[PDB]
Design a binder for this molecule. Sequence first.
Ligand SMILES: CCc1nn(-c2ccccc2)c2cc(N3C[C@H]4CNC[C@H]4C3)ccc12
Lengths: 296, 291
Amino acid sequence: GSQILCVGLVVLDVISLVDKYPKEDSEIRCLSQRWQRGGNASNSCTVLSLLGAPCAFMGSMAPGHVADFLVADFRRRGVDVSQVAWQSKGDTPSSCCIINNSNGNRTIVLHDTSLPDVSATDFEKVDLTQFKWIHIEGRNASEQVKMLQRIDAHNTRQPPEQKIRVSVEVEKPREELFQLFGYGDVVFVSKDVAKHLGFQSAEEALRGLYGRVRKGAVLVCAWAEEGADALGPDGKLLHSDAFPPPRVVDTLGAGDTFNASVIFSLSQGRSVQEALRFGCQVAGKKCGLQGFDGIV
Amino acid sequence: GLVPRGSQILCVGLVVLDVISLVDKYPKEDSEIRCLSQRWQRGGNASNSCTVLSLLGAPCAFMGSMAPGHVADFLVADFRRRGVDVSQVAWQSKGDTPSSCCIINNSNGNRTIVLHDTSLPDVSATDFEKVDLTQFKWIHIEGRNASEQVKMLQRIDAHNTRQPPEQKIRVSVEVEKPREELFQLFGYGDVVFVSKDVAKHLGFQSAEEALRGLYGRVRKGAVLVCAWAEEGADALGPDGKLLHSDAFPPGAGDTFNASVIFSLSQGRSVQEALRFGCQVAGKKCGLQGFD
Ligand SMILES: CCc1nn(-c2ccccc2)c2cc(N3C[C@H]4CNC[C@H]4C3)ccc12
């Protein structure tokens, strides 16, 4: 098993770069424009790829010129798309992204297109033998849990040296998702989810939510410019300072870059401290750049 | 393919891709939200007029700048969806094909606009030097880069000099932005459209004010035209008689300019053209798109 698989969304991001966020009802002129292959699982694949780890994306896509663009980009990055759950109903999602060039704040107006999510069925049709690691962007709970149990099963029939590592991201404050909290060896929970659950810091969210996780799991929580924290089975809290760049110019997919990096690091044998640290280092570098290119 | 001589109406100006999102409420900086709906539309003045002229049944051509890429590809396919001849486009090796982003608030109607970047070079007098003119009966110019467009109008003038009256090319000019550089364009064209927004900025409070105030700026023999929303539209020619037409309540300005051009190009009178202009732009306003 040599590849890392990420399961979630792909999206066409239509980006405008402005030097100040527009006031309601006003009209600004943008500095520059570009398109980008977005979506969480999609972004992660880009980062894993640029870091040298063979990987594969799996999510829904409607055939057309949009998809043509996205696939071209995938392949230009060496991301295996063979596992894509093609469709006929709905369109491929897109979004308008305003990025504030004076602090890299990014505002996203998303357009979901009814596109049916990957289902337990779809996943059942996948050859788990190719994959050292599988990461799942929490969207359709019920059905995703099903996929998770399938991987455990497969694991219960393997040497502890041939099991598939599983990470899970609960990014949205949404009750259906808290079941995911859940499975996997590594669980990512967003700052946004932690506040909405009443918590006002990472160590606090970490102490509050550790109870929900599979025995032996590592819970991970990033907190933007305050760094990231983690907490595992020994009860010892781990921390890493951020690596802010001098000028923050674009934070679109900062958290995806963080997630990808921590996975990469852990999948390469490194410790949780080290992975946490590396997570912060790559995310920091991305935020000082437009897009993904220059991080390596 | 073969365009028959003196058969087409040419429009020179901007094309742009508008991404249009309808939202519950204006988003706060650094949020992520779901729009109610989202739409990609071809926009720009010369671009919209072409669409209108096609639907009216005129052969017509667009001339503007684009850059190779997926935005142009959409723009080009949409141009063709509407029967527009796209073969005089000025392709550019530098810059971005214009793209604009518009947010419309469902619970208040307000429009927030992120306007396109400035990187793409406009069409130049030398770009335009390369065009063979015998194809066009009428040419219409969206005022943008004025000093360069004046050369283009001088070229058409030269062309016309050596031609029978019945193979002269009619010329119309459109000044929609309050930008001083544009006002020199008033001096060119058989027909000059001025927008309400420009008249007001010059301090005129009505079409009739605008027409009387600015007619001294047009070449001898020209007709000056100004549409004023629900107040209808006026026109003033060489004889000094103000012509008028009321609105017909149900890109309307573009639907209006294009409709007037069509009617005059079909040989109707200015009065009949104001009227026609008013009917169509009425119909457009109670419609979604140009369909
Ligand atoms: C620890 C990883 C990381 N560093 N920086 C980081 C970036 C710049 C300076 C310092 C740290 C982040 C910023 C993020 N975002 C999410 C929000 C959406 N836009 C504004 C917020 C920033 C997310 C993760 C990280």
